[PDB]
Design a protein around this ligand. Structure first.
Ligand SMILES: *[C@@H]1O[C@H](CO)[C@@H](O)[C@H](O)[C@H]1NC(C)=O
Ligand SMILES: *[C@@H]1O[C@H](CO)[C@@H](O)[C@H](O)[C@H]1NC(C)=O
Ligand SMILES: *[C@@H]1O[C@H](CO)[C@@H](O)[C@H](O)[C@H]1NC(C)=O
Lengths: 146, 144, 261, 141, 310, 146, 310, 261, 141, 144
């Protein structure tokens, strides 16, 4: 979707401060904990039962990174969201059959984790900008479903 | 033998037996009834000429008669006395010929035949007098 | 280690990467194919609990006739009429109770087995994700090297046409058939002892999936046998109730005795 | 097929015919030309009229053929052999024609000989002309 | 197909069962049914693509029966009987052995022809008849290599003839009923007691006759050194191990000129079939001669089969 | 067929002298004897084996009479021969299946018996006239065969 | 008939065998074959002139298996699932019980309508969907006489719907699997954890729950004098002997607004058929309330059969 | 006695005359239907004769071993080795000879029976010709009387339309059905006791026709059994020939004995 | 479903919110109108701008509703009953909207309270707004 | 009893037992921390007002506490000495309320609460000092 220059600027500048070895994995592990049915896809990881196991399990943050990266690619090219995730869309929709609702569910837990690290500095306009982003991602990721 | 000829041919010993051995003359004859016209039934029943076989004592005439099975009485007389007629061979039923022999005295020409023909059990037809006339006299020739 | 060959051996490998990547996917769908059995065996536990309480009254009664056949191990073991003819009416009662503690235990063991196999299923999956993802990644550094690798230039074209995921799932069959085309030509890989792993963990994993369908099936057989014979006990509950309390005068063979000595 | 019985009858009956055997032969032919006019096509040059010398004489031949036949009736085909070939081959007489004359010869004998024409004889007389009328024809082709 | 009605949400699978019409028979292995394909092919699961063919029955006349003498043919009880006339209006017999062929005698064939004449010469000469007036045309003619000993021809019809109640072939026997004690049926177009060629097909029952009695009748013998021509009519029959003789009728009916080539047909009561046990050679015997004489069909077997192949 | 007036006159005048209680029956029994296969149709009579039995058997002359009569009807109307015997033709051809050759065979044995009784008086012209008659009868009797 | 070829002197006897197309079945006694007559009639030797009809199978989805939570419907494993929207864009469930009819709840039916409203009022209001987008039109609507106790409707479709892999009825059970220890499958069009009406049909496995535990959960009781409204969401489910309760998921998935009328579908592994054991009444429970609650289908049996008749 | 009625009862009488006349015809065709069996049983005689001579040599031989087992009724009845082992090789020979004089006799008796029945057939025919011809003649004087009989004038028409012979043959069935229509209406006949005869001779006659087909059939069965076993004797003729002549030294048990006393 | 564990966490966390409960309520709403502009159609006459007194006060109401809920968390529907009917019936709020504000309330609490927002709490805080956001909606029709 | 409260509620004799028999006063209170601002966890966990039951000797206050299963140490002090706290009823797990009573001396207003909360085996959260302030003093009334 369209983004005002000061939206994209506030977005990218914030994304700069985002720890890329941690945040993504934390967003993922919370999703596992908050909406336990997604665990179904990941139980290959190890113990997913307790929140500490999930948050601790080394394959989880290992995984989150790749996911977080996948989100970094979005912020990189926001005009071609469909295309950037076109293949990723195939992995989840055509091979996996993830229900597209769990993309947004995850994009939101991400925005939660964003707000967790950045405190008052994650401002209502900045969320509102990121909301556009985790949507556009969730949709593009869901595009091969039609 | 000459009381019943069709009973006579029933002897199995006589069938296709050889009667032709020895010296013989062939003498044509006529067969006539009491008015001296041909006896047509006998005419037809007896082979002409007649083989006459030579012996030690008197020549024996041999008569060839068809339908022997329907012949009954066949008697042959020389000077009104009975000749001893006997059957020598018989030829079975598609043939039905009987072969008989009797002695005749040297000089004989005429012969008397008292005969009858009967089919199975039916009407017997008597033939009263039949005159047999050899075209030449009969003479024995023991020299052969 | 050096990767490349003719425009054939690029796609003999491309197909490998694709199967090698797709083992971590397919094996996933298969584990989930078995959630059904997991939750099913769980509800078997729920019901087996419920039955134990359902027949509780009838077992407690049949226990009473066991414990009253003990103080009866003095004057009662011999032809007591109204006693020895009780075991005649408890004929089928103790039959079913025998079947109950038999068949219930079976769905319990069937239960235990289905989890273990589903665990071995699970373990196998996680391994073959590593081994496979690892392996697929390696044969992708040759695949990416062939992109601008000085080229046969029809080899160049034969990379960029290639895509990350297979179009379809993977048998054990397809996999070996991917290792097959890979071994002979282009021993360029000569990694085949590791592909051996991803297949052997694959085989091992599917092995256990099949194990649960098989082992959960005979569970549901046993459970059905459980539900039935449990009804025979619950409806004979009234029968058995007065059956143990009919050993009443058998207790008078104690009371009228134990005082006088 | 001419059993002993037949053979006897034919002789005994043909005897009672006697010297008239000639004259019957002609009377018989005459009937045939009168009854069945088609038989005349075998005798073109003959005067076929009543009591024609040509007819009358020819009857003496046919008569004699027959007498010959009863003379040796026990072998007809040898006796009639030269006649087998004459009608069969040279003259080519259609075998139907013999059965006409056979019957005219039966009509004729009937008329002149009421007393011998008892059914039994009628049988063996017919067989006899059968047997003969066959032998002339069987070399037809 | 007078097309079947449709049913809602449903389809039709077509079959046909082949059956052969009256007086004919199914030939194939080949249970007869044929199902339509998605390939729209007609397919029998045993023989596949191959159709059956309909082959004429033999020895089953539609109306069975139940020459000097009798038995007028009222019904047409002898559908295998053929009347052949030579060039010069001479009527002669032949019998129908299958849809294309008829047995006959070498003799009948050779009428109005020189001993010189070959098959090619004779075939156009003949006129042939089946059934009522039914004129069957005539392609070739073939003679037994032993014609002078085994008196036998074969006629090939230009095309096959349609079998029905009045026209239909006779069975060739596996078994041989040439023995005495058997009885047979002879049809014929030959002459009768007015020595007229007959106006109506007739037939007669005749016993089969002891072979030695018959021999001794016609020649004198058995033993060949005592052989003489004893035959009651002028001409001698052919007599060997390939022939047999049939006696005269109960009523002295017999078989005369024209009756050669007519079949001596023995009805087998157990299997209810009509076999041709023999073909008539000597039709000369009539009143006067005690046995008509036939050539055993079993003895010309391997030859007729062999010829049929061409 | 056509008949000259003196033929018909010689015919009828002779037929007058014919014994109607005997001749027909004698013609019939001779046929039985001479052509023994016709016996097949008549064996209902009694013994037909010997010629004396046949000639003697009372059902034979009894029968012959009716037959002889049947012939008398012919001489009565010689122009419609077909019609007179039209029904009789049905008895033999359609019901019985007598072979038409035995009509003439019988008509001839009749002419024989005629000649037997009337001697020299049965003259070649008179036979030749009667021949026309026993033919016309035999044919007319055979007409329902076609 | 792509007409069979002819054979010489032979004829054809026609048969057809009726077969029902995919996802259908033969109904008749009635071995199915029909032979053509000389009367040119099509005749089965059992039922004669009467054709068969093709009847839809139930409980056999072409691609089987193997709401807040998961299981995206990849294949269309739930062909009997219908999505019905009320007049005001409220999405609600219904399941297809045969070619013309679908079960639903009295409640779903009554949305955007007064208690006053009768069936005739409600039927035109609704929009109904099967399969993908497939719009089935809607003839009448009929309510269970005990609607306030047994929460159940019946929908009649204007015509029958064509059965296939994505659209096809579910089997009504002879047996009753409402017992604990059984497991079931609920499909649904209802809301998810964003409280959005779902974009894709989903499904969840749920155990069936002990009736007393469930009762004590929603009311306080068992015994009616101790009954109080203990329900975790605002509203009370209908609970009687015609209902049963299904627990929460393994992963805490549950069934929310819109999921009523969706069938609690139990797969019978022995006969490999899908039965509708229950219909969802109370779809309100979601995260917060431990049991969604279904009306046993076995208990509405004799009524649904009865209604179908009209 | 007075004949007539409505235009119905003229026909009822017309149909009777026609059936009544046609019994003498039909029964004729039927007798001739059996000539086949007559001539067939005759040829059986011919062949049975022929066989007796065919096996003559083999019976004459087997007779010799009977007559040499007689002078052997002194020292030979007891275990003579080369003698008592002869009856062991004559085992099947005497079997067949037993069957021969058995089965031949059967076709002889079958023969005798077929003539008798064919005679009873014949007798029955001749009677029913009388009775039938008689009867048909009577009901034709009423039929001819109805021609110019003062008439119903549609009765007059109903005579001249009538023809002497039926169009078809006659069952026993058709006949009784002709008597049937005749009895009730128009007892005008009241001859029915005589129609009883023509039918009863009819029935009796057909009875015998059927008797010969039946009895001649079992004849041909027996004849076939005759031809077969006769071959076993003719081919074992050589065997038996040396079998009786092998009792040669058994005659030395006489010759070497009977002299010394 | 709010276990004892959940219940403890929600109280302990909402306590650490304290007097700011009001001020968060408004910050939360603000995010919602900024993030999801469609929710503004329920508040036509409100000044929706930054730190609007109308927004700020309304947040104090919403805050208090929530505090009430944790005050008696062991019976929410009685406590929230008058609010069940207000949103369900009178106001007709589309149940999707609660899940927005649910999340904005989660974003908001995250920002202001880093130390308590451990995953365990994130769970029960979400369940809690689930449980509440349900109770308001379940009378929708 | 007050050493571990979540172990205390495990006694089955106490479930849905009646604590409401007899005369009682209802006294609102405040719950404050050591800076005299509301103790929000305790505020939330204990029902306000508080039933105070009358006895022969001293009035017994009854406290209504939710999440009893996660409560551990609950000690109540009057003038810095330990009151003998005991559990009277408990309400099981959808409810999870514990009901406790302790005597208070006539004239008491302030009360000291030393408490702790621990979920299962996890981190124990100690609440050092909690001041309970009745909105009016407590006085026993044996006259009822
Ligand atoms: C393992 O799964 C594959 C499909 O990936 C299948 O072909 C094979 O049959 C399975 N194993 C067994 C033992 O069936
Ligand atoms: C149905 O929805 C419309 C939407 O505006 C509403 O106005 C109407 O009152 C509703 N009716 C009922 C009966 O709920
Ligand atoms: C008797 O003959 C008639 C025909 O006339 C026939 O119907 C019947 O079958 C014959 N025999 C028996 C035993 O019925």
């Amino acid at each position: 979707v369209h983004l005002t220059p000061e939206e994209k600027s506030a977005v990218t500048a914030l994304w700069g401060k985002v720890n890329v070895d941690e945040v993504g994995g934390e967003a993922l592990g919370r999703l596992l904990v908050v909406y336990p049915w997604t665990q179904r896809f990941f139980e290959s990881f190890g113990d997913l039962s307790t929140p500490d196991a999930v948050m601790g399990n080394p394959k989880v943050k290992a995984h989150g990174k790749k996911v977080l990266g996948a989100f970094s690619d979005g912020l990189a090219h926001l005009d071609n969201l469909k295309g950037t995730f076109a293949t990723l869309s195939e992995l989840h929709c055509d091979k996996l059959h993830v229900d597209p609702e769990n993309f947004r569910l995850l994009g939101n837990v991400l925005v939660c984790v964003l707000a967790h690290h950045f405190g008052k500095e994650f401002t209502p306009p900045v969320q509102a900008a990121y909301q556009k982003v985790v949507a556009g991602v969730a949709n593009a990721l869901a595009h091969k479903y039609h | 033998a000459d009381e019943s000829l069709k009973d006579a041919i029933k002897d199995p010993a006589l069938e296709n037996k050889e009667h032709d051995i020895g010296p013989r003359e062939q003498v044509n004859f006529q067969l006539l009834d009491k008015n001296n016209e041909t006896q047509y039934y006998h005419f037809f029943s007896i082979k002409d000429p007649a083989d006459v076989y030579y012996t030690k004592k008197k020549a024996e005439v041999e008569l060839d008669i068809n339908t022997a099975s329907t012949w009954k009485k066949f008697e042959v007389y020389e000077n009104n006395q009975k000749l001893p007629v006997r059957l020598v061979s018989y030829s079975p039923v598609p043939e039905d010929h009987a072969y008989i022999r009797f002695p005749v005295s040297d000089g004989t020409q005429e012969l008397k035949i008292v005969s009858s023909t009967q089919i199975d059990d039916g009407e017997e037809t008597n033939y009263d007098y039949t005159k047999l006339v050899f075209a030449k006299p009969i003479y024995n020739d023991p020299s052969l | 280690a050096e990767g490349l060959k003719t425009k054939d051996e690029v796609e003999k490998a491309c197909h490998l990467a694709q199967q090698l990547k797709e083992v971590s996917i397919t094996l996933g769908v298969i584990y989930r194919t078995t959630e059904r059995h997991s939750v099913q065996v769980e509800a078997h536990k729920t019901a087996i609990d419920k039955h134990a309480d359902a027949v509780s009254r009838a077992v407690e009664a049949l226990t009473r006739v066991d414990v009253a056949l003990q103080r009866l191990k003095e004057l009662g073991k011999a032809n007591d009429t109204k006693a020895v003819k009780i075991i005649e009416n408890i004929t089928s009662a103790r039959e079913n109770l025998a079947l109950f503690n038999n068949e219930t235990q079976a769905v319990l063991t069937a239960r235990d087995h289905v989890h273990k196999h589903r665990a071995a299923a699970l373990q196998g999956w996680s391994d073959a994700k590593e081994k496979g993802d690892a392996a697929a990644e390696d044969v992708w550094v040759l695949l990416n090297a062939a992109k601008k690798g000085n080229g046969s230039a029809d080899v160049k074209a034969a990379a960029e046409k290639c895509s990350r995921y297979s179009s379809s799932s993977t048998s054990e069959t397809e996999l070996q058939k991917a290792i097959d085309a890979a071994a002979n030509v282009g021993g360029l890989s000569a990694h085949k002892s590791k592909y051996g792993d991803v297949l052997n963990k694959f085989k091992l994993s599917n092995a256990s999936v099949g194990a649960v369908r098989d082992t959960s099936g005979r569970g549901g057989k046993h459970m059905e046998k459980v539900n039935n014979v449990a009804k025979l006990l619950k409806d004979a509950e009234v029968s058995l109730a007065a059956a143990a309390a009919e050993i009443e005068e058998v207790k008078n063979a104690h009371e009228t005795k134990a005082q006088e000595e | 097929v001419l059993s002993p019985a037949d053979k006897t009858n034919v002789k005994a009956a043909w005897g009672k015919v006697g010297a008239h055997a000639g004259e019957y032969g002609a009377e018989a032919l005459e009937r045939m030309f009168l009854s069945f006019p088609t038989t005349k096509t075998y005798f073109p040059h003959f005067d076929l009229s009543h009591g024609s010398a040509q007819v009358k004489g020819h009857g003496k031949k046919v008569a004699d053929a027959l007498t010959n036949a009863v003379a040796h009736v026990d072998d007809m085909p040898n006796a009639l052999s030269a006649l087998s070939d004459l009608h069969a081959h040279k003259l080519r007489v259609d075998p139907v024609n013999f059965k006409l004359l056979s019957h005219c010869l039966l009509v004729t004998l009937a008329a002149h000989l009421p007393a011998e024409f008892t059914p039994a004889v009628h049988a063996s007389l017919d067989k006899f002309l059968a047997s003969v009328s066959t032998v002339l024809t069987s070399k037809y082709r | 197909c007078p097309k079947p009605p449709e049913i809602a949400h449903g389809y039709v699978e077509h079959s046909v069962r082949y059956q052969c019409k009256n007086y004919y028979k199914l030939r194939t292995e080949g249970d007869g049914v044929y199902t339509l394909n998605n390939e729209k092919q007609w397919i029998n699961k045993a023989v596949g693509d191959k159709l059956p063919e309909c082959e004429a029955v033999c020895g089953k006349p539609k109306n069975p029966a139940n020459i000097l003498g009798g038995h007028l043919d009222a019904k047409g009880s002898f559908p295998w009987q053929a009347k052949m006339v030579s060039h010069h209006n001479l009527t002669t017999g032949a019998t129908l052995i299958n849809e294309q062929w008829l047995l006959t005698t070498a003799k009948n064939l050779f009428l109005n022809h020189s001993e010189n004449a070959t098959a090619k010469d004779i075939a156009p000469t003949l006129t042939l008849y089946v059934g009522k007036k039914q004129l069957v045309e005539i392609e070739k003619v073939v003679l037994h290599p032993n014609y002078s000993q085994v008196d036998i021809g074969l006629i090939k019809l230009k095309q096959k003839v349609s079998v029905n109640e009045r026209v239909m072939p006779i069975c060739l026997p596996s078994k041989d009923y040439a023995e005495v004690g058997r009885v047979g049926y002879v049809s014929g177009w030959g002459r009768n007691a007015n020595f007229k060629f007959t106006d109506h097909l007739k037939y007669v029952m005749l016993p089969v006759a002891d072979q030695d009695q018959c021999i001794r009748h016609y020649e004198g013998s058995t033993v060949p050194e005592k052989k003489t021509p004893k035959s009651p009519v002028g001409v001698q029959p052919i007599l060997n191990e390939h022939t047999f003789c049939a006696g005269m009728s109960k009523y002295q009916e017999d078989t005369c000129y024209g009756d050669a080539g007519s079949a001596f047909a023995v009805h087998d009561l157990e299997e209810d079939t009509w076999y041709a046990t023999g073909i008539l050679s000597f039709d000369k015997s009539c009143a006067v001669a005690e046995y008509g004489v036939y050539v055993k069909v079993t003895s010309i077997q391997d030859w007729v089969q062999k010829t049929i192949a061409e």
